Design a protein around this nucleic acid. Sequence first.
RNA 1: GGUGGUGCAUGGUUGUCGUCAGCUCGUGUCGUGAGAUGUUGGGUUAAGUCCCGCAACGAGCGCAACCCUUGAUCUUAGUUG
RNA 2: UUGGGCGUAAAGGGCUCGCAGGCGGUUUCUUAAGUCUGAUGUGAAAGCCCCCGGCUCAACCGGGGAGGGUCAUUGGAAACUGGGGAACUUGAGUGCAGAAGAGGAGAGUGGAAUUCCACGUGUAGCGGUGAAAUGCGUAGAGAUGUGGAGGAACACCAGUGGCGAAGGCGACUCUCUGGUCUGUAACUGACGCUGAGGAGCGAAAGCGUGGGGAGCGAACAGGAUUAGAUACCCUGGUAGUCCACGCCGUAAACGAUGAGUGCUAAGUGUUAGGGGGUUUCCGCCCCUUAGUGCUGCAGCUAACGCAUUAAGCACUCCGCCUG
Lengths: 164, 218, 206
Amino acid sequence: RIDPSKLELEERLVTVNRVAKVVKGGRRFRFAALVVVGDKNGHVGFGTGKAQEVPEAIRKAVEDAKKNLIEVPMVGTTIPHEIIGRFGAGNILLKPASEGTGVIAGGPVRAVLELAGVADILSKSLGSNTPINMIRATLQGLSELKRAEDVAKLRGKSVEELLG
Amino acid sequence: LLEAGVHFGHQTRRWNPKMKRYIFTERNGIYIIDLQKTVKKVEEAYNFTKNLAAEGGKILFVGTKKQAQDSVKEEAQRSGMYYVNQRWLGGTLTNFETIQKRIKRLKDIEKMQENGTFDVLPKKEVVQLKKELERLEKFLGGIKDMKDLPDALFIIDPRKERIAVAEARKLNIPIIGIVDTNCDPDEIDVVIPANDDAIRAVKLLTSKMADAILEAKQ
Amino acid sequence: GQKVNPVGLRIGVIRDWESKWYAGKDYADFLHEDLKIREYISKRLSDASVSKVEIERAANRVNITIHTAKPGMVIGKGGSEVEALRKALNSLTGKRVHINILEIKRADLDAQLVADNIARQLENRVSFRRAQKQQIQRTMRAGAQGVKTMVSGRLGGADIARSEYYSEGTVPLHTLRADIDYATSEADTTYGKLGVKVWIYRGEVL
RNA sequence: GGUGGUGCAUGGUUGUCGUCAGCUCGUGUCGUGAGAUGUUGGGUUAAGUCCCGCAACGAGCGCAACCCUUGAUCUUAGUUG
RNA sequence: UUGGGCGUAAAGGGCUCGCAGGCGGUUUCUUAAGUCUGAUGUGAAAGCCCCCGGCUCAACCGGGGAGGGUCAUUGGAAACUGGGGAACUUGAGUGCAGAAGAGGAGAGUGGAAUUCCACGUGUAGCGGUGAAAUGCGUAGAGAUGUGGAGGAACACCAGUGGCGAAGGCGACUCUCUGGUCUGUAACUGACGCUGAGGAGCGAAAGCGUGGGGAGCGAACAGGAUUAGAUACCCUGGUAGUCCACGCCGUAAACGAUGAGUGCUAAGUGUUAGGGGGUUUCCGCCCCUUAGUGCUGCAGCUAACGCAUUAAGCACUCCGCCUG
């Protein structure tokens, strides 16, 4: 599945990284920028773009993020349950919280979750501090999340006894 | 036919174990039951293609197997939708824009050689141009008049055509194809488990698909 | 080791000298007064902007043709001013002179005018990035076949200078059939000196 | 007014590797990332020259040509030759 | 622990046998130590927390609660961990029939060589390196044909073959002796795994005693190269290399991967088997254990890469790591 572009999406440039290549004529520099893009209703996804000029590199990155998007469950403006993101030594814990706490996460993680629009959530970063790997791990977790209704239908049961 | 023409099986016994694990005593190949299990899935693909034709989508047939290109060519022409006959150049769908903007050059060249300028360099222009014409058109084939992404794809050998199926995944195009015993049924939405080596069977079944969509049209 | 000047190379084969007079035994002083009048008119018309001025000789009477659309606005209101200034050229040359104004339509593809535009945008404190990136696409959609533009000097990072150039299109400099018009201009800034080089591929010649 | 300093404040010029055959980008793919592909593999030429394959398809600056000049000749022109 | 790792980043002990200790196949009665849950008795006051009242909010000060025991007595429950009793056989062993092997220790035996010696023939060099030189030779070398003397290793077979826990183990025979695999189902019926300390093995060098010493060869000498050459090269050559008995206890003792158990796609060699389909001919194929390699899914991996001989999924036990 792919989510089309019939939406209003904001972009939050998390980081631009200086990048260099070594050649006979000294050094060759470029600019690699990753950005997380997505509406607040619940659609998210990152992108990347490398080029020699920062603004149009960001343009590349936002186009990539638009091309690659993901949905997330949003039970009560908060995740339904526990989850650990497990991408390449990027360990991120997420926990649902009461309806007044707010967003509690690291920089890149906070950008991703706030862009998703989750109002009340807490987290923790246990793996490497690398931003892109943070993003990949947390989005793997967010994908791994499961709504309650599909769980009920999978079990052949109903929400009332699943919550009971 | 709906009886077994040439669908018996593959030449050798080194294969993918995907859906071969619980069949009873049949033959050297344990897999006789494909001769029966193939018919219902051919029917399912028939209905799928009928719905595609009914909603008006345009299927294309891709094939580079040395004993299939001509067959898919002639069947594609009088079925009335697109096809590939030669080297499946990479990333056509994911870079349509490039492909449209480059076949546009071919169309402009047909215009130049049919009505436009014909004589500026009485040897040089003609000798380079006509060669360029045959060069690019031979590789491209019946992909000239796309102006839209196909609604579905039909492959003849997903093993040889790794790039074809791979490109299909990212765009989520619904995908069909005949599946040899050495193929990988996992990723294709509908499986026609026949032997890719059967030069007779491939055209017998692709014609059975062409007339399927032709009858679905009216 | 840098490139040859492209118009410097193309003069006389696909380009005219912009000084179309023959002289002999008077070549030196004719040339000298040509540079003098060029300097005068360029200095005193820089605000109105002008690209190239040709000079022509007849019976010891100099005559001029001057380019760009803005001296078009100098025709109407400056019509008195045209006579007023050409009086000065009469005084300088000794013998009286004639002039003509020719309007360069589509100024976006004149090298010297583009260079002067860039120089002004730089000297009134605008960033080289915005100025250059906007001007290139302006000229391209004005209808050139290819552009390359370049600035050099202490580009904001005052402690050290560097070079930078943008371009999008087709621009063959090694081919001696193209019409690569060339110009350059100097922009003085507070933090140093800024130079500009811009050229455009208009088209081939046949 | 500085042919007084500062070419490690610069413009604008010039040498050098080197007339060597390389150097890059658009879009797309693979990688997680530095990145890779195209730009590699067969021969080819002076050449990234061309053709053949190839997740690449193209484009740009380079090479070639377009320019000058010496080599055979046709038309026009015959003075101061 | 909640909350990490040990193939290349720090980290698997060199290997094994095993006391204590930690863990424990299936069924079935019983016991309630662990276990879960009531009742009672306390866990002072003042603190933190909840709810109220008062200092002109509170700082604070009151009043009432709640919490706070790996807590004592007593009652209740028996699924699981312990205790006891009765089963059972898959785990683990025994017996029975085969099979293989450089498995280990002791004795003897044999073939080609190298060297030395005596002998015949034998002239002028032999040997050696990138060139050369030191060396050996007319006191007759080297070469070449005989015969001895000795000490070391077992050519091809030999194969990413086999065995062994590891070090390691290759000529032959014999004496003694260890372990493994296959098929059984006749036996015992959980007798199992791991294992700090402990004990034993543990290449080569090395040490002690007594022999032995062909070749090789640390040290050392001579000749070369070099600016120098305490080396690389050449000619010699002591100790060692070997044998018997003790000692040391280290190696990149490496698969840089602890031991045991179960599960998780395939393909392909090869070693020792067993069964079956055509013949109880050969050799054709299909199953099947146990090894021993090579590719390759999922999975893991930071990358390499591992991938039923996991570096995957899990459980016990030990060792080790924290710039």
